[model samples]
Target: KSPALDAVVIGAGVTGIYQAFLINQAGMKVLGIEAGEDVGGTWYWNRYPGCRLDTESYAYGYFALKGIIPEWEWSENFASQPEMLRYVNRAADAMDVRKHYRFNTRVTAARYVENDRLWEVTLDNEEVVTCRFLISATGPLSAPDIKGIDSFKGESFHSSRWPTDAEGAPKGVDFTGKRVGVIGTGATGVQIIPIAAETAKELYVFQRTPNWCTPLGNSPMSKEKMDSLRNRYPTILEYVKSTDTAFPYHRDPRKGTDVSESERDAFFEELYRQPGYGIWLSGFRDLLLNKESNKFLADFVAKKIRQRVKDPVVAEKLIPKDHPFGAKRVPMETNYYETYNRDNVHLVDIREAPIQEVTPEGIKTADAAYDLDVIIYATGFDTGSLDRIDIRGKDNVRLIDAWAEGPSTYLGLQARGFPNFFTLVGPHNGSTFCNVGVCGGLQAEWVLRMISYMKDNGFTYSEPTQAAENRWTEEVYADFSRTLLAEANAWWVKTTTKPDGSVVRRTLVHVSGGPEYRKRCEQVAYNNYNGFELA
Candidate 1:
């Protein structure tokens, strides 16, 4: 058998690419495993129409790769999937990271061989690779969770698993003059509906719940603007790191009720007209904390929805009622509500008439059956990517068994008993809440630094202490429960049923701001890697 490599990084996405580069730069032998044939984990897979970054393109790009920042210029504020994919590929090429990756490969199972103090990783091809360290850069939003998708005879696919041709290029589906049905109204559905409306002969949107969506307000980028951003790249990157959600925006310090009703309306109107997440993230401090304040903002958004959709009945259905504004991850859209105004487009409230099953021709609802040429399942993703893989820690305890109740990690980096295993953007992490590029990059850097520290200190293994993991999990849930997000049933909050038929909401993300989480990580590192057991 071959000697064990220093590290094995999973998923060749934005985080994985940088992780592989950093490990190699640190004079360690690292191998990157990617299921896709290329880089761009989410971008590579989600090639459906109108798929684009809700976050600003420039800020979302790789800030760690200083060399690539000056060379690549975003055409728009929010880039489409193709442009985003191109940027990830460019970053990988610039760093020469592709040589370290095994594309079109996946890690099937990984077991910590305590005797060897290394991870025995089994790949899909039955290749067992041993590594001193295992890094899961598998993104939180990568796994698509859909039901009864295969039963449909017509052209059907999950939005994330967009089909590709024989040549490995995206096989574009022509919705022109064809009846189309899109299930679920999450972020992906919000983006696809507007584009599908333009071409589909008849469009039926099967909406289970509506989202609080704001306009992306995307505009073309000029050469001068690109050059200006390049000059201030350092400052921009720092600004993102310091912000709450890792965006270039921060929450307003004042409460929603600080201003008079008229002033608040004017402020709301201004934010509505503005681009990006200013309305949600940067509007008011109490938006997600106080119910009265959240209701005020929610009402303001509801009015905006009413104004956009032509029909009153349809408009009411479009406004989200289950959760408060800013509680869930607000999706940015371009003429999404206006798309419903089109005569060819029909909105089906699936809550009223739930979809029973997919028939040979199309979808069958409890009340009616709709014949369709194509069906798109925009049903959101499973929270963590670890559930798909079999990973065993100390004493051969499976990760699934360990996290049976829910995922519990110290700073969302390392789980207890998982020595030499690091998870980027995993459960109860700030990365899942923040702009993934910034937070995920920060996490990868931190993980690499820790590995370097371990090597320097002659430590063979490292894991978070049980007490530390417990404390962190408690803190994460306590913080999450205080916010309006706890009141919502979004995918970020895992809903699990117990053996006794009881249900529980598990915390899948850290609600605290990015800067705060960064400080916590810094403190741990400063204290000589406190709260962890190093051997």
Candidate 2:
């Protein structure tokens, strides 16, 4: 609403924070607009029970501030929600980003002023802000799914939009002596169940499809390990940058077929019992590609569940069968399987009998009705990406309409028609395809570099050409088709609702991650920024 800014970064999450800091460091007049009361975006908002970072604490952050990052200590291997929020706030404080950020302001609409060569963004209260470059850092999972929640008479809550105070900190809720039920066994649900089981008098988990969960084995980090990491900080950062999964761990090349049955079982046991995401990462090379290899790993996990839970039927209900190992999202857990051993915890296989309605007391299925004092919906966000925001390009062309057939962007950064507009965590990038934190850092750095390049060259605007965007999207989808991802009916795969109400699976929402994805990004920049037009 003031004088035109150099850049307006939307959504004050990790991506937004990093982007704002980088641009400000480049001497650009930038402002960060956040819908939440303060920063930390997703971490600031989602504070459900058992909420913690899935990615290891060491790797799940911005490494641009090399000096601050290497020296800053991590108390836990897997930091909880509070710790993560603290880390995010610390990053902002170190960079003095709060001075450039405005909290509790939502971007309602953004349109490119073709003649002015600027973007005019409208706030929720109809206030207008103008900027030369518009960066939509709105996260991939920002929009919480709240379908059919209003009709529910009982206290219902969404995982993402957890109740917060005036300053955006979580308000504590007492669940002791309460009958709590959680629906949807995705990443959030998997983590919530174990913690809720600890506090609630009775816990009911309604599962439409069971998710394969491996033990987190999380513990406090040792000072020895921290000192060792500090010594090799530069090397570690480079190694992570070169990795395909954006993680430091190596994928053990030896396959299940390479070893004897006894040796393979022994190796499986060791990996199965370990902490971090290494349980899935340190496995056969073709674990997800080869059905035999995938089934071997899947069976190992199933056996672990059976051994942990006393009841055989409950163990069977917990096992996920439809998807191959690592085909779906891999969730980390602590004592998840052991929680079922508790007499007060009950597992509702909703697939057998779908939820018919939510009654005043609890959820009602076709066959049975359960009683609950508190209901938590662990159902995932509206993965509609940029569609959640009202974005318009040249001639006021709506972004949602343009991307209805699925998103198409060059390097998941710029689209053809949206001039001088960019995205940080856009689809078809290395985002959810691998370590999300790494993806955010990589993309944010590239965008910042591109902006600086433009400033140095005296360019006023930039965007990918139609031909270039098309070519890049074609290559992205072609690479996706070669993988088993296309065949699976999962969230990462784009969906289209048919005229007959049937949903059709489209291309992969994200490209494959690791060294290859990084190399492609480097190649584009190396080739005079091919697939992009600067003016």
Candidate 3:
């Protein structure tokens, strides 16, 4: 639409918005485009019940502005969707990112113009925009499975696509006096169960694998609390940055490499007493890599689940016994297990019960026949990493086709063939159970740094070369494969496995934290993207 804007950013979410801020601050004429009608990104789209940040609000956000942090207030240690989205919107407004964006015009196709060294981008509205640089802030959590489930006839919708507007969905099934069924009990399922149980006449949770859920112990943020945190923001942020996952850690859950058994157990007990998700950073820190340590955490979580829930039988069914603690996404809950104790709420292990089919009236499970009015498939997304848009490079190959072998990005930012483009929160980008805010910021910062280096040096384009990409992907796989991650079928592992069925990391690198990953990426940028080239 605009004749070759200096840079084109896809998605007006936090990453894209922040990227535009960085480039625009650098005096680049950037076009920030989003398919959503607004700037909240996934938070705007994912208005589902129980949608909230797992990490505490203090550690979760963009630090672009020095004084802007004082404006918003968080209620809980972890803030809900409303608070988080509001913060992003206010930041967007404060940073002047609103006018630069084109909302609701989805990017349909993007191709590199070999002759001009510009990207010819087409939107869903049939308009075209061209630019020298293209950045994708299309986040991982936003994309819908966007499918009509063949087996469900009564009612079905993805938790990610749940409508949160006050009017409710036009044809939406109200949980009140309804037999609601939630299919997958991952993070979303765990988050919504207590809420659903509270409202629905009867709620049936279908679980393939029971996830490890710790107590949220969510509490209010008072003036005293705010003042304490407000005064300590600098020390807090620095401390958060130094840790691996960066979740405002209490104890040094990161134990030494040669840490002993008794010491590790004592630390686990000590950290288990702590509030929120800092317990993930518990054990010897090698629990994610070492099988024995992983088994210890897993058994401990199962014990916790059983102890928390009232029913012994239900506890056994709800406790995940098969996998390690952090192998699958670990969840912290308000009352996930306790919800099953309610007379109306039920938990069915899907892997064992096997949902036969959905009748027009209800669902058919092995043990009993439940008549359910609504079916919510919190079944999660297509886990293929959300950068599926037509990102073109190297003889005009689209990234989805080029990555037909599953997702792989050098350091989870740049691809081998696609020079000049960067993917924010791309696969192998460390989408883990830890501090997601730090993870996003970490990737975005590195990409911005590379873009800065390119601009500073007057270079045109940059992408990881094939040799470098291969080596890094192999390193990624080698790191993951050495751990218990290889044995499981989690999203991170699922996205990284090639068509030939190879992985990027050998072990699930539980070593260090997001800060360490950030440090490595910063090192790469500091090295001037050594493996890349310029026009």
Best by lDDT: 1
Residue 501 displacement in candidate 2 (angstroms):
20
In model 1, the runs with Cα more than 4 Å from the true position are 1-3, 144-153, 165-170, 490-506
Model 3, total clashes: 22
lDDT of 1 by residue, 180-283 (tens): 99988888898888988888999999988788888999999999998888888888987887898888898888998787889888989998898788888778
lDDT of 3 by residue, 320-420 (tens): 66777776556778877788888888788767777776666667766666677788877564434345466677697878777665555677677777767
Ranking by TM-score: 1, 2, 3
- lDDT (Cα atoms) of all candidates against the true structure: 0.84, 0.78, 0.70
**What TM-scores do the predictions have?**
0.94, 0.92, 0.88
Supply every candidate's count of residue pairs whose N, Cα or C atoms clash at under 3 angstroms: 0, 2, 22
**Best by TM-score, which number?**
1
Lowest lDDT sum, 10 consecutive residues, model 1, at: 62-71
lDDT of 2 by residue, 202-312 (tens): 999988888788888899989998677777777867777766777656677986677777877888899887778776877877676666777788888898889998999
Clashes of 2: 2
